[PDB]
């Protein structure tokens, strides 16, 4: 009945359009945070996607998300949606197809956000993540780092930024932290993550428009890689317990897939919303 953390875990490519005026080759760019330039989803897009999924359940939509745009009478929604910040991203590797890349700065920002928002299971996650971050800083000692926690993953190569994965044996990764951040997790410096998540390294796809075999238009598209993880905060205010429980159970159902992003018909931005499990 308070602020809750949700994880997105996109199962496909995701393209949430900024609508910004492009200065380069990529016509369609993805939404990025103003301050940190990390990929993000606007709260309006999150609310739109979740309302689209639940649109059939009219009472739940009216109670939680509010009235329709054409409704003759307006009811404010009881649920407040926040921005979805990038948690982890898949990066190309050599021993494995990919690794889930996280940075120290995004971990610190997540800790600050949970402290500021006071999530449901905030305390244990804050304590364990703070201990992990302090151990990481103790082992790094001001140097650029890339730490794997699976012993088999030692010596892994991040392809885009040519760095090698080290294994600190005295830094334990708790199972809940693995469930939150992902499997085959790599913790590296935020400079490496910023380079990996910048415009020159995010996947760019060429697209065509053909009329009777003649190309009408050409443009390039930017997408967020599949299996990337994003987190947002949901504030319910104080909604009906039955509608809120229905919303949480439907969201956490393994068979529930939410479409966030532009290209729905060609399978862009299908995700599985998770809840912060108790530690």
């Amino acid at each position: 009945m308070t602020t809750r953390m949700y994880v997105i875990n996109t199962l496909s490519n995701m393209h949430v359009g900024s609508g910004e005026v492009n200065y380069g080759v990529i016509a369609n760019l993805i939404q990025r945070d103003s301050v940190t330039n990390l990929p993000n989803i606007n709260s309006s897009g999150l609310k739109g996607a979740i309302r689209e999924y639940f649109k059939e359940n009219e009472d739940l939509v009216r109670e939680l998300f509010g009235s329709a745009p054409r409704d003759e009478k307006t009811l404010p929604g009881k649920v407040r949606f926040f921005e979805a910040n990038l948690l982890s991203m898949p990066v190309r590797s050599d021993k494995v197809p990919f690794l889930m890349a996280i940075s120290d700065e995004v971990l610190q920002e997540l800790i600050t956000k949970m402290k500021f928002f006071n999530c449901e299971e905030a305390t244990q996650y804050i304590s364990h993540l703070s201990t992990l971050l302090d151990n990481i800083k103790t082992q790094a000692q001001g140097t650029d780092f890339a730490y794997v926690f699976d012993p088999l993953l030692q010596g892994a190569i991040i392809e885009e930024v040519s760095i090698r994965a080290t294994c600190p044996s005295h830094i334990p990764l708790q199972p809940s932290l693995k469930k939150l951040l992902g499997d085959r997790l790599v913790i590296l410096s935020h400079k490496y993550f910023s380079i990996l998540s910048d415009d020159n390294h995010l996947p760019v796809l060429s697209r065509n428009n053909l009329e009777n075999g003649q190309s009408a238009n050409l443009w390039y598209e930017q997408v967020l890689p599949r299996y990337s993880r994003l987190y947002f905060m949901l504030m319910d205010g104080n909604a009906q317990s039955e509608y809120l429980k229905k919303f949480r159970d439907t969201l956490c159902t393994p068979s529930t897939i939410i479409q966030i992003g532009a290209n729905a018909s060609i399978g862009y931005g299908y995700c599985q919303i998770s809840e912060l499990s108790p530690f």
Binding site: G19, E20, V21, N22, Y23, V25, A27, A216, W219
Partner: protein, 590 residues
């Protein structure tokens, strides 16, 4: 002696109040009308004017453009103060009456309420200084600074009731919104006409050709000899305020003319120009003994010739007064481009400066001092793109880039302007931006001082297709992507001082080494020459500026990188933007 200086009008706010081209024109001409009516008694009483040269020609209607500025310095005999006060009150009472209930779409109006609103809104401040010298060079800046400080006193209406229609209090936007009047019908087989307000009948005259402006498409697309406004008016009046309906109908009518429709017909260009350091020019004409009346003559002649050129090209003059110009013109019509119009305007300004300021031109020639010049800001946008955003973009271009006010503003906010840094202020620039319907935005800046501008204009003239008539020069679109992709290599080539031209020619020959490219040697040579000229001008203008900016310790790294411009990359971007504009004009989705 007994000089009088008059400043009037919250021009920026009223221009902000317009969301359409016709509303912008009405707002701009409202203040010209006010100034004309305010100053016509003093001109009729034949007193010497030290600022604006008010002759018979400026009082005549000139294609619906406002030639009357907002600042007037005026020599007054005793008895002009209360005369000016009473005339200001009377010219508020009139106009308040003129907006009461002519053939204007509305319900009813209270003359006293309109007069109160106009008095609370329209700024009318005048200063009667007692100076000791009759020299214009002394009286003009001394009164100008006091006018500048006078402009900071704010007067506004306290209450604005706008609801239940018939008790309105915002009448200026009623005037600008309803300036074409109410479209009136009197027959089943005739041409519907606009019952224009007092502004239209004072601006556009009353002698035929009375197609008053309505929606931007008619000048956005005026080369097809299609009376789009007549068809739009007949379509609107065939069924059943009206600005949106006319805009939609005009768009549809332009859509059924796909046969001879080119993509630039839906794009509109905004032109803004200001005088490059007119105050320092006046100081120079104070040092060398040249009267300022010659400068006023040159400015008035340039204004008249610029109005004529804008009308001949096919655009619309919004405001041309003093050193300031605002024009709405088609991107390309009847074979001429926007940049052709800009070149013509620059040529007209130079011709008027030479004709009316020959003594000062000769003095500054051997003295090695800069001459008066025009900085230009051009914005081309989709017709549906917000006009406020387009005007803000044009202002940003002109002021910040073309007048180099980014450098000066960043330096002054940190209080490091000094004088050696002031030596690096660059004028005589052309800022141009084209934003597509998808927001691709091509922007560049160029210096009109050297031959790079001439070569740019010649390239545009050469490689832009003319309408079907005998052959053109066969522009090649593959060079656009080559320059973008090979930009760093071109920078490396440009940085080689001894073998720059040979390396550029060799690179273009070796990349475009196929049989088809034998017909594009002229294009390759032209772009090579333009690139070399632009790089030379850029290094001359910006090298020492970049070194001193980097050597500065106060400025932050981000502000340093914003202020620092790379000469080679800037030249490459200019070539890229020129080629993109050529391709945009040339290509049509058949």
């Amino acid at each position: 002696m007994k000089y009088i200086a008059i400043t009037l009008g919250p021009i920026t706010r009223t221009i902000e109040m317009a969301e359409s081209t016709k509303e912008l024109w009405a707002a701009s001409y409202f203040f010209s009308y006010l100034a004309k009516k305010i100053v016509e008694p003093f001109v009729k009483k034949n007193r010497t004017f030290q600022l604006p040269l008010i002759n018979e020609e400026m009082q005549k209607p000139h294609c619906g453009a406002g030639l009357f500025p907002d600042r007037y310095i005026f020599k007054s005999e005793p008895g002009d103060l209360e005369l000016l006060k009473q005339h200001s009150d009377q010219v508020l009472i009139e106009i308040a009456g003129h907006i009461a209930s002519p053939s204007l779409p509305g319900t009813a109006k209270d003359v006293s309420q309109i007069y109160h609103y106009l008095k609370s809104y329209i700024k009318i401040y005048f200063i009667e200084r007692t100076l000791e010298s009759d020299d214009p060079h002394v009286v003009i800046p001394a009164c100008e600074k006091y006018l500048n400080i006078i402009e900071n006193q704010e007067t506004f209406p306290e209450q604005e009731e706008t609801m239940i229609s018939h008790q309105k209090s915002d009448f200026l936007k009623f005037l600008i919104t309803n300036v074409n009047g109410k479209i009136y019908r009197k027959d089943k087989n005739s041409i519907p006409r606009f019952t224009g307000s007092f502004l239209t009948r004072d601006a556009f005259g009353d002698m035929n050709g009375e197609r008053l402006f309505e929606s931007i498409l008619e000048i956005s697309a005026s080369e097809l000899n299609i009376n789009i406004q007549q068809k739009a008016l007949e379509v609107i009046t065939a069924n059943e305020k009206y600005s949106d309906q006319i805009w939609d109908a005009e768009e549809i009518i332009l859509n059924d003319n796909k046969a001879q429709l080119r993509p630039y017909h839906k794009y509109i260009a905004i032109i803004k120009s200001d005088g490059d350091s007119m105050g320092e020019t006046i100081k120079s004409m104070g040092a060398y003994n040249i009267p300022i009346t010659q400068l006023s003559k040159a400015l008035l002649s340039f204004n008249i010739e610029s109005i004529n050129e804008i009308v001949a090209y096919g655009g619309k003059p919004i405001f041309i007064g003093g050193d300031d110009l605002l024009c709405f013109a088609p991107v390309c019509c009847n074979g001429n481009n926007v940049f052709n119009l800009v070149e013509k305007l620059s040529t007209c300004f130079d011709q008027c400066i030479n004709q009316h300021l020959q003594q000062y031109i000769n003095a500054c020639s051997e003295a090695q001092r800069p001459l008066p010049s025009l900085s230009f800001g051009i914005s081309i946008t989709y017709h549906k793109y917000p006009m406020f955003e387009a005007l803000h973009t044009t202002d940003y271009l002109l002021e910040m880039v073309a007048k180099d006010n980014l450098f000066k503003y960043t330096l002054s906010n940190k209080n490091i302007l000094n004088e050696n840094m002031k030596r690096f202020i660059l004028k005589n620039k052309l800022a141009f931006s084209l934003q597509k319907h998808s927001g691709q935005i091509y922007h560049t800046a160029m210096s009109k001082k050297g031959k790079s501008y001439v070569k740019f204009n010649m390239l545009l003239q050469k490689y832009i297709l003319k309408n079907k008539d005998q052959e053109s020069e066969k522009f090649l679109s593959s060079v656009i992507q080559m320059i973008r992709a090979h930009a760093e290599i071109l920078q490396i080539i440009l940085q080689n001082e001894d073998k720059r031209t040979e390396m550029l020619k060799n690179y273009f020959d070796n990349n475009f080494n196929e049989s088809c490219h034998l017909g594009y040697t002229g294009l390759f040579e032209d772009i090579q020459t333009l690139l070399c000229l632009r790089y030379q001008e850029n290094i001359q203008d910006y090298q020492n500026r970049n070194e001193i900016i980097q050597q500065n310790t106060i400025l932050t790294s981000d502000e340093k990188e914003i202020l620092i411009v790379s000469p080679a990359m800037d030249a490459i971007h200019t070539i890229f933007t020129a080629l993109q504009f050529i391709h945009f004009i040339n290509y049509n989705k058949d």
